[PDB]
Amino acid sequence: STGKYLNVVRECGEIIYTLKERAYVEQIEKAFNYASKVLLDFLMEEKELVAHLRSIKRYFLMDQGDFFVHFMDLAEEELRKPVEDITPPRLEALLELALRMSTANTDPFKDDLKIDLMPHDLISGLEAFSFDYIVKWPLSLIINRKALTRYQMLFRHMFYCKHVERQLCSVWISNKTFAGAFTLRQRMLNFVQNIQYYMMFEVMEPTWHILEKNLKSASNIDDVLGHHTGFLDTCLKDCMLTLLKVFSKLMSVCVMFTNCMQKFFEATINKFDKNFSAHLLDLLARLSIYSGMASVISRLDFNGFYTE
Amino acid sequence: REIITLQLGQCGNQIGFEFWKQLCAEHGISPEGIVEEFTDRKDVFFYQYIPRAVLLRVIHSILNSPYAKLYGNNWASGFSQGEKIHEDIFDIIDREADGSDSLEGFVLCHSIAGTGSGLGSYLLERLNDRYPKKLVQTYSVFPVQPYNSLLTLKRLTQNADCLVVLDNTALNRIATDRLHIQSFSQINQLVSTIMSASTTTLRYPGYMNNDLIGLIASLIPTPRLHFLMTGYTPLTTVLDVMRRLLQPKNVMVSNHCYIAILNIIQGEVDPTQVHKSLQRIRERKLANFIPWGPASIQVALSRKSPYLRVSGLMMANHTSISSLFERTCRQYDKLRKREDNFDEMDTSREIVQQLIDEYHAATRPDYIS
Amino acid sequence: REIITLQLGQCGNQIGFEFWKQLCAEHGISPEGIVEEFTDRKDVFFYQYIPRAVLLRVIHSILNSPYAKLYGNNWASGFSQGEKIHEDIFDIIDREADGSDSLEGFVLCHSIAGGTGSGLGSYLLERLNDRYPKKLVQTYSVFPVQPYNSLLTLKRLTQNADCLVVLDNTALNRIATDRLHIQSFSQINQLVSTIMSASTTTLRYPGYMNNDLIGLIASLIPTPRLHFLMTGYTPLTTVLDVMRRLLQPKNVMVSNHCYIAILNIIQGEVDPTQVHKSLQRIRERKLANFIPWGPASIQVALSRKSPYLRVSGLMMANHTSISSLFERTCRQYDKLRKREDNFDEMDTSREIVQQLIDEYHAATRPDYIS
Amino acid sequence: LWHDKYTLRKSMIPSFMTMDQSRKVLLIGKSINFLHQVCHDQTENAFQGKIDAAYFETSKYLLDVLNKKYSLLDHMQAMRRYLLLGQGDFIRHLMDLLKPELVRPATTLYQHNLTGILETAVRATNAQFDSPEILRRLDVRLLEDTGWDVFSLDYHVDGPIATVFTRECMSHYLRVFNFLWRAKRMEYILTDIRKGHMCNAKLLRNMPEFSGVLHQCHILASEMVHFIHQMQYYITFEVLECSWDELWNKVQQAQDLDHIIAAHEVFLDTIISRCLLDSDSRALLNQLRAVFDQIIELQNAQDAIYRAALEELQRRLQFEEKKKEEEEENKRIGEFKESIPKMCSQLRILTHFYQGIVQQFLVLLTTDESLRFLSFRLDFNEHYKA
Ligand SMILES: Nc1nc2c(ncn2[C@@H]2O[C@H](COP(=O)(O)OP(=O)(O)O)[C@@H](O)[C@H]2O)c(=O)[nH]1
Ligand SMILES: Nc1nc2c(ncn2[C@@H]2O[C@H](COP(=O)(O)OP(=O)(O)O)[C@@H](O)[C@H]2O)c(=O)[nH]1
């Protein structure tokens, strides 16, 4: 573990034997403790590991807001087209233009974002889009293809929830210059914007806040490799990503209701109500039966509503 | 998405001129419109730096101020003269619209109490004709005065897609209670604190709320109940701030229940005790909401400007705002029994009555139908 | 290949004099027409040094300037007086032409708003189309009884001049009040001369492409009718920022719709490897639209700033919106036609400008062909 | 001298010298032998530091003598301006003077005549203000048809500077110069046509029955000049200005004359690769030649339609100026209108085949990475790809 650190820095830019005295055992540590301090600092100041994980969080966890509100605004018409119909030379030209025009311009590692259209959905066109990140050799020990697709599994689950309430909030202006759908839109908007808040500030954030501090007291690489996969298996557990497929079908009636309102009937709005409200009550029934996974209910209802 | 702002009348100019001064300092921008060396998204309000403002004898006071390189009393007089310069002021707004990438809104700052009342009534009508897809938020300020006030309310209840009330009366109390002033040059310092901290989530991008339509559609459930009041405590944990916002001593307003609450915490408070306080607010029951629809409270964090400590602002949609109207509605009938058709006032009179009824119907368990 | 320029009327003479001042300052040439000690190809516009200019009251002002060592109001009156002195001016033009090794074009700088310059330039354009059939004619015409003269100049310019660059005093004054805070001719003329000097940058500093006027013309103008161009000058830093600030309507000197051809000239010392990324991202974000019928693209070229004199840039566009301006003039003419020997020439002018506006309006259709 | 005369010996390299260090000495020795003869100028761990100390000084000096006097460096810059058309100003005038000569067949062409033309261009353009030494080597050579198939420049180099080029860089430059010469005459043709149309419509703008077919002559031009005027930019920015930057960056910091040879040898392996002159990209270049041919066939089918309208116009001028009979010409004017739809079927079938060879050209680019930047240049605004 000593020389290997010396090589991922070199290519980029006395000991005696005694018995009953360890004048060499201590000598190896006085060098290994410098062999690491040059590499770790090499990753934080120049090509900014802790200053390298933050950049991935901005796009994968969608921390940076100015980049997505400007990217989906440009690449929406070219995503509703079906799969095997869109030219990647057309998307990447919009991704590059999305970063520079936004406030993500101050990012040294921004040039490692690549478009990767997955073949399968979250078990087309829009449900088959996800970023890909390529990293060099020495850091590839920590963030590798085995533990990067996990970053790509909890990304699409957040790009879906960000897309629906992006257009659900878009129909909000079209109707505002037949009159009983406003109290139903309230039932779905107060559901996604009550899942997103729990998903961003009380799930991944807390885990991330711990990891940053949990990497200051690291002692060896096979521990950092534990504080990382110990962070991804928690985000995928506290979220609904690990089954709970009722959420998948629950989202269908939300996005489809946006299509009906976009076709501008009175017997169809009330049809969505009995269908969506029934699907929601299936969620809180299963979210409650457990041994946080319980505080989510306090986020869904706050007025004692849905007390049935 | 850019937001082009408007300033009408002596009030709108003074609050906007002091709104920009609060923003120009919150960024590293010298009053000479030159960036100082000394991450914050600044493209929404500034054009690469020049503010996107369209002002309309206080103007000379700005041209003599060090910020010069940064750019009657009847309601009928305001609406009449506004028709005579229909093409003049729309030349400016149009040339400022297309030059922008993608217009998003029209934050309009005007007081409903002389010419700002009649002119603003003219603009909010004309914008909906040409621009039908542009949100129009207004930071209206509450004070023949009963006449000019309510007439603007006719337009502000069917044109403006949002409205933030800031009455001078309740502000004057906070000016007297915790500032001991006895002046316009002081109460506006509080107004500029409310206007700037309102759009703190647009200029500092976070997890959510990266666009104006994200702050609007969350609070306003229906096109009519679109009036919001504010609350600003710092004049310490998140529980200390959340408890102070709900006290009636802090709200800028002189049964009843909330509709939607959004909390803005501009501190460096760790994001782990954010759910604990919300859990506690539910237990002690410091606020009640509508019984018919599911109403929840939302809290949002942000980051203070390093170039300039925990603060807090709350965007509230409270039914008790209906009280401010009744004070206007009441004094109107008194002036209606004291002295070419005089029908616009009566037609405006009817629609305000439809609005107040809608509020008092919002607190009923059967507000639907 | 040598380009000869002509200056007519007060506006044309003033802008040409300021352009020559700017160009002499860009090179090492003293006002006394003597090279100073202190790579730049200067043979095109200068003769071994004397400029290739033909000036046609302000001449006395120029003769009193330190640069002395360097050399009615009706349209019908201008045309008549230009017909009267055909041989007198054409002897000068012909001696300066045949004195040159290989003539290339005839740059004409004049104001079509009114006076004698309008009619004189009309007559000169007709006579140059008559005599020289193989010489390109570019015109740096400046836009403002005025509607009459303007429309007549447009009638003569839409068939004779093989290219044209519009300059509206209204947009220039708007920019002056906005970002220069003037409230004057001698101030807007500064920006005019800046745009002009930056227009012919690639001819004086040789690069990979654009070593001749045809290289600039044939790229933009696809058909002989659509030969009106507009200008943009953003610096008043990466190339992406420059290209994003250029396509903003705030900078274009112009008072559905789409683009026909775009050309960018970058005079900075920028890294030339990021230009393809800039174009990729511009196509991604879809900041500008093109014609639907034919394949039209945007071209970009670099150059070097004058070392004797930072990143700048200019943009030449073929936008279908320019027709709007003509409409106004057209409109006014109609308003002037109903309020007051044959008076038929003005009618023919109205007819041909109506033809041109119809062609512009049809250019933005997916079936513009036929 | 650079390409030949200095070849490493794989057999007599000592074991205590790594294979990479043996290419910094062969590049340092060649940098000094070429600095004397051709340029016409005369002056362990400490061991590794000595090689680099002699590298970052000799090479940095070779460029100074090759940029101020024209001196191994002052030849590299001067060999890009002329042999790689990097001058522009000089090659423009040189294509106007060789036009009356190369149109003749090659049998009547003799080298001793062209040299007077080349010498005339260097005196007229800005290339006169130049080092006399590098101008002594710039000459012509005749490849062994038409004059536009056997003309090419050579710039022969012998002496110490010949150990950097080594007879192979001079066999690659001419392999490149052919592609830059073709893509330069295919452009000056398309600015001649585009010049004809600006003087064409200034004469026959009075025949409203001819503009219907004359229009298809303009659209096919403006659709053809785009494909060429865009490929010129990919040649300038993504092949020349980009691959040369990685050479002048690995020269001002290299040394020992063996990091210069290896930096200049790979500079000729990317241009051959970035241009379509590779070995496995054969199907792509032969596909491009067909597009180069369609530009000529337009220029032949244009003047035929152009001149046929000037004759009928000239007769119509004299048929009325001398008289100011009437029935014997209306059949001539009547038949002339009947020949118009015949010519329209030419430009309607020439265009429909030109688009069939470009939309096939793009499909071949999706094959090796830098070519993707070309597909965007052509397909801007998606004029193709539906
Ligand atoms: N909050 C606040 N209100 C103001 C200020 N200045 C003026 N106002 C309000 O504006 C109203 C007067 O408007 P006025 O200036 O006469 O409008 P004008 O006729 O267009 O000039 C008063 O009723 C005040 O309530 C200020 O500095 N702060
Ligand atoms: N942009 C610009 N236009 C000018 C300037 N000087 C004059 N003009 C224009 O020239 C016109 C007057 O032309 P005039 O001198 O009367 O022509 P003349 O009768 O032939 O001498 C006015 O309408 C102006 O718009 C100038 O310095 N800049």
From Swiss-Prot, chain A:
<protein>
    <recommendedName>
        <fullName>Gamma-tubulin complex component 2</fullName>
    </recommendedName>
</protein>
<comment type="function">
    <text>Component of the gamma-tubulin ring complex (gTuRC) which mediates microtubule nucleation. The gTuRC regulates the minus-end nucleation of alpha-beta tubulin heterodimers that grow into microtubule protafilaments, a critical step in centrosome duplication and spindle formation. Plays a role in neuronal migration.</text>
</comment>
<comment type="similarity">
    <text>Belongs to the TUBGCP family.</text>
</comment>
<comment type="subunit">
    <text>Component of the gamma-tubulin ring complex (gTuRC) consisting of TUBGCP2, TUBGCP3, TUBGCP4, TUBGCP5 and TUBGCP6 and gamma-tubulin TUBG1 or TUBG2. TUBGCP2, TUBGCP3, TUBGCP4, TUBGCP5 and TUBGCP6 assemble in a 5:5:2:1:1 stoichiometry; each is associated with a gamma-tubulin, thereby arranging 14 gamma-tubulins in a helical manner. Gamma-tubulin at the first position is blocked by TUBGCP3 at the last position, allowing 13 protafilaments to grow into a microtubule.</text>
</comment>
Curated annotation (Swiss-Prot), chain C:
<dbReference type="GO" id="GO:0031122">
    <property type="term" value="P:cytoplasmic microtubule organization"/>
</dbReference>
<dbReference type="Pfam" id="PF00091">
    <property type="entry name" value="Tubulin"/>
</dbReference>
<dbReference type="InterPro" id="IPR008280">
    <property type="entry name" value="Tub_FtsZ_C"/>
</dbReference>
<dbReference type="GO" id="GO:0042802">
    <property type="term" value="F:identical protein binding"/>
</dbReference>
<feature type="binding site">
    <location>
        <begin position="113"/>
        <end position="119"/>
    </location>
    <ligand>
        <name>GTP</name>
    </ligand>
</feature>
<keyword id="KW-0225">Disease variant</keyword>
<dbReference type="InterPro" id="IPR002454">
    <property type="entry name" value="Gamma_tubulin"/>
</dbReference>
<dbReference type="GO" id="GO:0031252">
    <property type="term" value="C:cell leading edge"/>
</dbReference>
<dbReference type="GO" id="GO:0000931">
    <property type="term" value="C:gamma-tubulin ring complex"/>
</dbReference>
<dbReference type="InterPro" id="IPR037103">
    <property type="entry name" value="Tubulin/FtsZ-like_C"/>
</dbReference>
<dbReference type="GO" id="GO:1990498">
    <property type="term" value="C:mitotic spindle microtubule"/>
</dbReference>
<dbReference type="GO" id="GO:0140490">
    <property type="term" value="F:microtubule nucleator activity"/>
</dbReference>
<dbReference type="GO" id="GO:0000212">
    <property type="term" value="P:meiotic spindle organization"/>
</dbReference>
<dbReference type="GO" id="GO:0045177">
    <property type="term" value="C:apical part of cell"/>
</dbReference>
<dbReference type="GO" id="GO:0005814">
    <property type="term" value="C:centriole"/>
</dbReference>
UniProtKB/Swiss-Prot annotation, chain D:
<comment type="similarity">
    <text>Belongs to the TUBGCP family.</text>
</comment>
<comment type="function">
    <text>Component of the gamma-tubulin ring complex (gTuRC) which mediates microtubule nucleation. The gTuRC regulates the minus-end nucleation of alpha-beta tubulin heterodimers that grow into microtubule protafilaments, a critical step in centrosome duplication and spindle formation.</text>
</comment>
<comment type="subunit">
    <text>Component of the gamma-tubulin ring complex (gTuRC) consisting of TUBGCP2, TUBGCP3, TUBGCP4, TUBGCP5 and TUBGCP6 and gamma-tubulin TUBG1 or TUBG2. TUBGCP2, TUBGCP3, TUBGCP4, TUBGCP5 and TUBGCP6 assemble in a 5:5:2:1:1 stoichiometry; each is associated with a gamma-tubulin, thereby arranging 14 gamma-tubulins in a helical manner. Gamma-tubulin at the first position is blocked by TUBGCP3 at the last position, allowing 13 protafilaments to grow into a microtubule.</text>
</comment>
<protein>
    <recommendedName>
        <fullName>Gamma-tubulin complex component 3</fullName>
    </recommendedName>
</protein>
